[PDB]
Amino acid sequence: APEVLADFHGEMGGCDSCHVSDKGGVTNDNLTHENGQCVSCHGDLKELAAAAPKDKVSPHKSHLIGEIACTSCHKGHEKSVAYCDACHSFGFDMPFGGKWERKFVPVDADKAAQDKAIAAGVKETTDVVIIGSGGAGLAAAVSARDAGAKVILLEKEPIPGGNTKLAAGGMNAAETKPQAKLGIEDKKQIMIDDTMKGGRNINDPELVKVLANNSSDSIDWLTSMGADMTDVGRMGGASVNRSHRPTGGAGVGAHVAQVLWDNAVKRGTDIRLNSRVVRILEDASGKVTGVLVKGEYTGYYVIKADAVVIAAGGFAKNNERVSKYDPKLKGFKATNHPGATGDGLDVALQAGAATRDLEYIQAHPTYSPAGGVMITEAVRGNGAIVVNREGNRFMNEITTRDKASAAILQQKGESAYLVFDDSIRKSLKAIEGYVHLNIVKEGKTIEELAKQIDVPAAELAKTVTAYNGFVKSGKDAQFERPDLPRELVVAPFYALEIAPAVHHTMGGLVIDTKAEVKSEKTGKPITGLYAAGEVTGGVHGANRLGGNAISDIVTYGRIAGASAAKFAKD
Ligand SMILES: Cc1cc2nc3c(=O)[nH]c(=O)nc-3n(C[C@H](O)[C@@H](O)[C@@H](O)COP(=O)(O)OP(=O)(O)OC[C@H]3O[C@@H](n4cnc5c(N)ncnc54)[C@H](O)[C@@H]3O)c2cc1C
Ligand code: HEC
Ligand code: HEC
Numbered sequence: 001a002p003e004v005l006a007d008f009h010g011e012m013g014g015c016d017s018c019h020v021s022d023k024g025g026v027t028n029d030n031l032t033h034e035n036g037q038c039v040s041c042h043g044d045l046k047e048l049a050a051a052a053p054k055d056k057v058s059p060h061k062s063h064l065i066g067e068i069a070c071t072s073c074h075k076g077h078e079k080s081v082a083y084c085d086a087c088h089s090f091g092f093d094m095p096f097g098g099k100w101e102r103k104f105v106p107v108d109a110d111k112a113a114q115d116k117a118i119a120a121g122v123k124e125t126t127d128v129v130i131i132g133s134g135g136a137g138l139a140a141a142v143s144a145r146d147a148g149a150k151v152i153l154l155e156k157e158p159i160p161g162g163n164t165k166l167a168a169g170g171m172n173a174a175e176t177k178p179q180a181k182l183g184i185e186d187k188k189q190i191m192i193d194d195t196m197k198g199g200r201n202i203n204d205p206e207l208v209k210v211l212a213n214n215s216s217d218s219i220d221w222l223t224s225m226g227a228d229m230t231d232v233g234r235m236g237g238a239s240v241n242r243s244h245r246p247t248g249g250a251g252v253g254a255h256v257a258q259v260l261w262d263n264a265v266k267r268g269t270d271i272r273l274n275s276r277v278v279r280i281l282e283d284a285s286g287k288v289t290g291v292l293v294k295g296e297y298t299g300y301y302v303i304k305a306d307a308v309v310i311a312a313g314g315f316a317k318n319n320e321r322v323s324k325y326d327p328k329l330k331g332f333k334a335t336n337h338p339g340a341t342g343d344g345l346d347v348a349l350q351a352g353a354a355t356r357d358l359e360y361i362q363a364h365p366t367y368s369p370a371g372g373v374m375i376t377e378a379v380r381g382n383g384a385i386v387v388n389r390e391g392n393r394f395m396n397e398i399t400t401r402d403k404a405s406a407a408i409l410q411q412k413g414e415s416a417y418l419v420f421d422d423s424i425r426k427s428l429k430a431i432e433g434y435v436h437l438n439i440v441k442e443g444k445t446i447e448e449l450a451k452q453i454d455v456p457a458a459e460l461a462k463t464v465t466a467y468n469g470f471v472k473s474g475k476d477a478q479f480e481r482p483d484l485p486r487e488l489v490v491a492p493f494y495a496l497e498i499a500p501a502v503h504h505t506m507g508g509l510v511i512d513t514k515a516e517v518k519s520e521k522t523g524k525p526i527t528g529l530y531a532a533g534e535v536t537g538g539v540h541g542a543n544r545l546g547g548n549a550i551s552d553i554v555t556y557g558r559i560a561g562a563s564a565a566k567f568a569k570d
């Protein structure tokens, strides 16, 4: 029994097969050579993908964006797990396979060993350091690179794009070209007012102004980098159709993550995967001088830089931490990728950074317990209805998420069903992937759908003809639903069991419109420390509206990148 990958290969050629040297060892955390050797012998992703069965789901052709290494799944000296295992359950036949498991390691554990190495010299310099490879960081790698900084960006997972790459529903922006093309009359103020009402007026009004005001330049920016943001639909809590997404209702996440990845990489961004930043370095009256990296394979190393951008994401995946704030959520499932655990929040805190709103944890109301994935709010915005086990509607389906989850939780079985038709289906191309994931019930009639779910045919049917009249009259007499887009009358009929999940953390680092990280001692910025995206707080108040986090990450990430780079010129 030879079982792990490198031992299997051991039997054939040794150590230089994968390693540069015949003694073994990696030379860089990206594992450049080892993957290259894999590709020399087995072909690369296109070629692997090229040969799979023309039916369903292959592990070499997925929706992960950016450069996805072989070794990020085919492990050499330990069991291998497909990365997909972190979110789906396709039960693949992984040669040399183990099961998925991730232990949370405190950024602070191994304090002695990091100190020897901060002492053990400063190994390398650069202008701007950017932490994390989601939109905030990539948006910022571009913008800093455009300004002349030399940038180094670190990502702790084996693959890039963090939660951003999974987004679907859209990016909000007011007063855009796409809206002009569709004749949607919207106003930057309205977007402001929508953001403030929905975050229960505790949002920092200065950050919501910039987020609203810069939104349309920030659609334009993406377009000029190659993005396609021409599809606009509704999301809950907004009064105007403002969620931007690729032609036809395709999710934005993979699309935006990959245009931004391309552009960071086409400027000379030095991106390092499997590299986790475990500390930001210190000095006099606390000026940021660089950071301490912990490479998975090459260990601890200090990189000196003038400015440091924190684009590290939220902590909703770490239920422990989520639960200390809102014990309600102990044990709920999350919609996040695995690395959304809190890491850069600690890092920043260990650096004196100020924090705000950390106890306001959003729960997304329509998570698919069978699929193990989130169903976009855009299904509801596009016209779906939500219905309980008696076949009756219990809420306004484009309401704020704190409220939508609460209602679903007070129904029998803590869960309800998304009910939409064939027009809703063809108006939102993301629906097509829940369909490819085998989790959508299809009945040829409303009553045939009811059998499939297990709901009273008479009552579902009753609630669907009831809801169509509200759609013709323009007034939902049951719940208060302000947008009633589509009659829900073209057969075949679809249904999906949804239930709430932990999703996004509104709190975080305190910043100002320049992406500057403010101090807990003074209220004044820490010189040279900047940040953007969900690791920061203030933008969303106590309930993020759907659409504002991709808007936040682009707009703010662009600001931190430009801002940190000017710092570097001085
Ligand atoms: C499934 C899903 C769908 C959503 N869809 C939408 C949508 O349609 N519209 C919308 O507005 N919002 C949506 N959101 C919310 C939106 O995705 C933002 O929450 C997310 O994009 C945040 O971007 P970010 O840059 O802040 O971080 P992320 O995308 O999390 O990027 C994170 C990088 O930091 C790396 N990292 C963290 N700590 C360290 C460390 N110490 N060292 C090194 N690297 C580190 C992490 O691994 C991570 O990859 C959705 C969220 C989810 C999960
Ligand atoms: C390994 C490379 C993966 C394979 C194969 C697939 N995935 Fe994913 N996945 C995830 C989510 C949250 C969704 C819904 C997409 C969204 O709405 O953002 C999906 C979707 C799929 C689909 C159907 C959709 C499509 O056809 O594009 C397939 C066939 C699929 N996934 C296979 C979540 C995750 C995830 C968590 C962070 C990971 C690592 C992967 N998926 C990876 C794989
Ligand atoms: C290709 C199949 C390999 C062969 C043959 C050998 N190694 Fe390797 N090694 C490979 C990978 C993909 C990786 C990255 C981590 C992983 O286990 O997937 C590695 C890593 C190492 C390391 C670093 C381990 C760590 O610091 O965690 C060492 C010291 C190492 N490999 C040594 C080594 C020796 C001595 C080998 C010959 C007997 C050898 N490797 C063969 C892939 C492959």
Ligand code: HEC
Residues within 6 Å of the ligand: 009, 013, 017, 018, 034, 035, 037, 038, 039, 040, 041, 042, 070, 071, 074, 076, 095, 096
């Ligand atoms: C050339 C020197 C190789 C390098 C470098 C790597 N692999 Fe390889 N691999 C090679 C051969 C000749 C074989 C045997 C083919 C056969 O006759 O079956 C393999 C086998 C594999 C397998 C199959 C495991 C199984 O189905 O049990 C896998 C998944 C595999 N190799 C992957 C892989 C990866 C990810 C590599 C980079 C680290 C890699 N191999 C290096 C030839 C060579």
Ligand code: HEC
Residues within 6 Å of the ligand: 038, 039, 042, 043, 044, 045, 048, 059, 060, 068, 069, 070, 071, 072, 073, 074, 082, 083, 084, 092, 093, 094, 095
């Ligand atoms: C995780 C998302 C993967 C990445 C990235 C790569 N591979 Fe893969 N590989 C993975 C799985 C789950 C499987 C098994 C499929 C099954 O269920 O049997 C495989 C299989 C292989 C094989 C076997 C045979 C073949 O299809 O030719 C080989 C040779 C292989 N993988 C190599 C390989 C290389 C070179 C990759 C880099 C481009 C690579 N894989 C990526 C999971 C994943």
